[PDB]
Nucleic acid binder design. Sequence first.
DNA 1: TGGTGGGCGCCCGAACAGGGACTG
DNA 2: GTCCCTGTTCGGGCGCCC
Lengths: 555, 412
Amino acid sequence: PISPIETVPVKLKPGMDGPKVKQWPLTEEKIKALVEICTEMEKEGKISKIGPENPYNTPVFAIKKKDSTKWRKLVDFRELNKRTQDFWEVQLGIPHPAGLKKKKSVTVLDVGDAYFSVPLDEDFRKYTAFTIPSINNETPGIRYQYNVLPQGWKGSPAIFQSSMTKILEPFRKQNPDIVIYQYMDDLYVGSDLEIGQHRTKIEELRQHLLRWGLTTPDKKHQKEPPFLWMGYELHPDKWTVQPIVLPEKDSWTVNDICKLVGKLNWASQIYPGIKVRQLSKLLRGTKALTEVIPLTEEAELELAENREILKEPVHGVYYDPSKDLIAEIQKQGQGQWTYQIYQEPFKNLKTGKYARMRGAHTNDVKQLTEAVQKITTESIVIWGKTPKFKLPIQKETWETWWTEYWQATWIPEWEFVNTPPLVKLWYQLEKEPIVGAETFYVDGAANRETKLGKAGYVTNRGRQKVVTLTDTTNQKTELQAIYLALQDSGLEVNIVTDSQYALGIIQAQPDQSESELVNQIIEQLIKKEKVYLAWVPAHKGIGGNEQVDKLVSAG
Amino acid sequence: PIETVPVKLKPGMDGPKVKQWPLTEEKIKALVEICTEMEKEGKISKIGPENPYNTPVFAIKKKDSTKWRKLVDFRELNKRTQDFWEVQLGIPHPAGLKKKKSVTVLDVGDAYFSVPLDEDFRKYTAFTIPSINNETPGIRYQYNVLPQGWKGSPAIFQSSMTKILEPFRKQNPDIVIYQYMDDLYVGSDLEIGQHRTKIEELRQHLLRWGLMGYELHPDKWTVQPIVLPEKDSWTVNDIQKLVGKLNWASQIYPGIKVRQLSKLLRGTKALTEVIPLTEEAELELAENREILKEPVHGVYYDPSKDLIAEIQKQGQGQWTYQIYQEPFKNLKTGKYARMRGAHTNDVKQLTEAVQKITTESIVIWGKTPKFKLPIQKETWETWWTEYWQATWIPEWEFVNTPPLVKLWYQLE
DNA sequence: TGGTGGGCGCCCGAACAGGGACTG
DNA sequence: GTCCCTGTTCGGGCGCCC
Ligand SMILES: Nc1ncnc2c1ncn2[C@@H]1O[C@H](OCP(=O)(O)OP(=O)(O)OP(=O)(O)O)C=C1F
Ligand SMILES: [Mg+2]
Ligand SMILES: [Mg+2]
């Protein structure tokens, strides 16, 4: 049947016209599929034979469906889509099992030929013109247009999703306490009703759907835990992901890799420990999806680590709104982080990994603050509240950082967990100049023309060093100079720089950086017992900044 | 039986297309209740995906309360809406309001629903209510009346607002009533007590057509001047900081000179060496310290240009701010103080700081400043709404501020 | 076997967007 | 103005859902 629902008005973008793009060569097996599909659709009013009054046309083909018995008729509207107006998508995100609550009774329903059950705007139908190439001595042959939503058009998903919401509103209003998770044409229906009253309620849902033109075949998941839903399988008391199988290719290529990450990431929603740093790094400047490349002793190593964790069995549980949410985070390497979220001690609601690099320079405390952020926003989407945190970081370490850091930073209600590795600051700049520590006035200049440079220092104790660099920059020569001063100073040292750039990087207490120069500086800083970085405005004759400046300015 | 007044976008600009952000359960529950109610009242309508526009919505729980206020973030639509503002308003700004002993702020949002919105403009006021765990696709509405928080709402309703206020202003001439967006600002020099009595009395006239806080005392606001440290001995370090501070400050007050001080530092000295200040250095330090007293000369508020606010975290609950339109040309420099406790929430504190500062800006220039927030974007956007209490929302941007400017404005 | 759509996620590279420092 | 350096946005590919 076709839904009696009102259409959604649809325009092409101004000034543009409909697609005139002729069919391409189609297989025999699929033309058999396509005409059998079409002649039935056309019996049902879902499409209409058009005539030569219709200028337009768009290619069509056919792939299989999940069971692999049925065919799906797609239309390549790539051209029409470009020409079609913009929409606002109403699918804001993806429901998650860990956010489901325990219900007494569960049903999973699917709608039949879903799209082909929603009317397409009448004024727009003529742009959906396609043509079935038929066996070549028995017709050119047949030309149709859509009276319902096509699969390949840019607007179908959103118009379906909106049309469904419209259709379910009356039922939802009438049944405020039956929960219907609505994903495209997928329905999960839960109730606190007993099996037989639930059943009656489900049939009412189906009559309601069918009054609006939506059928529900079976495909009706019934007294049938485990339910198959959204790529999961839900049992009364636990949920798990349908099996994941990572490739085993021995020559790996970009495309092979990119889908190794994919499934791993996907995997990490409930397999704790997954990491993909090394793997993702393989995939840098590789300008081609085909390019192969050896898994670094580091990567090939990492791949085998996850590959081991997937072997163990694991489920998540469902959500009790009356217990608290707890996120526990643990640290890995290369700015990689894992977390688990639960309400009861060893019963994961779900899990995940954070592992972005925000910034050229940074440290653990920042990266931890960022994983906290991520998890918080994720919880608000899934459970609509914020979790309590268990973090591998001492209340003291936090307070120190938040007292030193010039930005507003904050972590929700949280509590320390002795689980190593603990998050620490690897050094601390002094607040006051250090008595009995040699004072270094550093500076570097660079010749923007030649790219040639000089970094160097002068110290109150009479030492002075100047290093010519080649192929450099002011900021580099200036970082280089701090690096010279640390190199040649004792365990305690005062350094005076004129560079905000440098002072800014170092002040913020990085422990990792994209820059090897800064990495070396960091090794130096962690080795030292006391360091005090002071700043002064440059070219002001202040000493002995004036001294170093004259000295590194041989260019 | 009222007629709709046409309204348009600026030329060459299209309506907002801003994605809805995740909302907590408590907020979504409130929005769904407010909106069902506004739908009954015909004040908003459900719409489809074929409307291409979107503007975020959330909700706030004002004071200790069980009453929520829908808050649509329109500053993108406002940025884009016809210059209604600098064209269709005969509005000077009440210079006296900033002097008034006590100002009270009233939320005359309801008053706007009493006017319909140009059908052709409705499209642009669309928003989208999220569901928890995406159990549903978003539910989308567009406005039918004047939207709260929209730039065009006080403008279109200006005259009707004047009619209602008019009689109240006539009987109370020394009461100054100013309007900004959903806000009525009401100041007087009445003894606290008579003032509220009088305010309850304006709200009595306001119930007559149909159908918040806290309490402002503007003339107690004040400026945080730049200030120099006073020491009985100075170290090379002490003086190196001092020269840097002054040198930068000279960009603000061109009277500041740093030469005699800069020459106590000749040579290559240890930072902790003590240098006794020479007569000149000593005197010159006294000049500067006074020069800083003097008011910043040559600063003129230009309404066409936008107000910039910078904020620096000073630590221990202190926050400093400046409001300028051109660099070093401050209109107001201030500090915000708050609890020095252990459980301080920086982000809460930052957003209370931006609300205070925004509030002062409205009262003093009747305009909203563009803030430069010393916080990471994601951190800020994770929590700021859990602390908001205003009915407006200032533009902003996030910045990595130099550990220099934080010390330039530091206190003692 | 090819070839379609929308959503979210993850990475990575592109293009910007700023500020700060330079030249003579 | 020019360099730098850093941040952001956007798009592309892959995963998963329908
Ligand atoms: N590869 C894709 N390309 C474009 N669009 C796609 C694709 N895969 C899904 N879709 C959209 O999801 C919808 O799928 C609905 P289901 O898959 O349950 O099938 P049915 O036709 O409604 O009926 P049945 O249940 O009776 O078989 C229809 C769409 F077009
Ligand atoms: Mg189906
Ligand atoms: Mg220098």
